[PDB]
Amino acid sequence: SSANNYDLLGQQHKFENSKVFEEMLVEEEIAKDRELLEDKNLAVHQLYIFDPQTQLAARPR
């Protein structure tokens, strides 16, 4: 079990470390906008529903 668990851990760490700088920055902006958009009474929330993984407008509300 320990070996298999560390294999899964290795895969996760490989995934996180391998992303290029431009992607890491873009993900930092995604996370920041996720934090800003936590408030649901914002005007922009009424306009559209945002995709959870990437805070991009998915559909109109």
């Binding site: 005007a43 009424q46 306009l47 109109p60 509300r61």
Partner: protein, 121 residues
């Protein structure tokens, strides 16, 4: 039937003939009862009685909430606009009305932009 109770209301006319004539009078628009809503209430009573007679004869033998609020607020805005149409406006009365309309059109634009006017919800 409203009746004058003072000499000044009766145009300082003396005698008891006038009082009797006033009390037994008919509702005429070209006499003492102009712009009177008493006929309207006589009409309401007649209509109610007519319905009551029909009713008794056989016996013997979220979007909606939004539309209601928008309706109420636009209705009050139109209520404000009604006095303006009832006056011969000047240039400044026109510009005050234009400011009022601008505020109303801004609220309408907010409703349109935010998707309230669309009824999908």
């Amino acid at each position: 039937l409203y009746n004058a109770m003072t000499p000044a209301q009766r145009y300082f006319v003396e005698g008891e003939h006038v009082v009797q004539a006033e009390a037994n009078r008919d509702i005429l628009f070209t006499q003492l009862d102009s712009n009177s809503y008493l006929p309207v209430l006589h009409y309401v009573l007649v209509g109610t009685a007519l319905g009551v007679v029909f009713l008794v004869l056989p016996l013997l033998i979220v979007s909606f909430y939004i539309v209601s609020i928008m309706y109420l607020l636009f209705d009050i805005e139109v209520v404000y606009l009604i006095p303006y149409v009832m006056t011969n406006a000047t240039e400044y009365m026109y510009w005050v009305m234009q400011t009022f309309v601008a505020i109303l059109v801004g609220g309408f634009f907010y409703e349109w932009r935010m998707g309230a006017l669309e009824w999908r919800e």
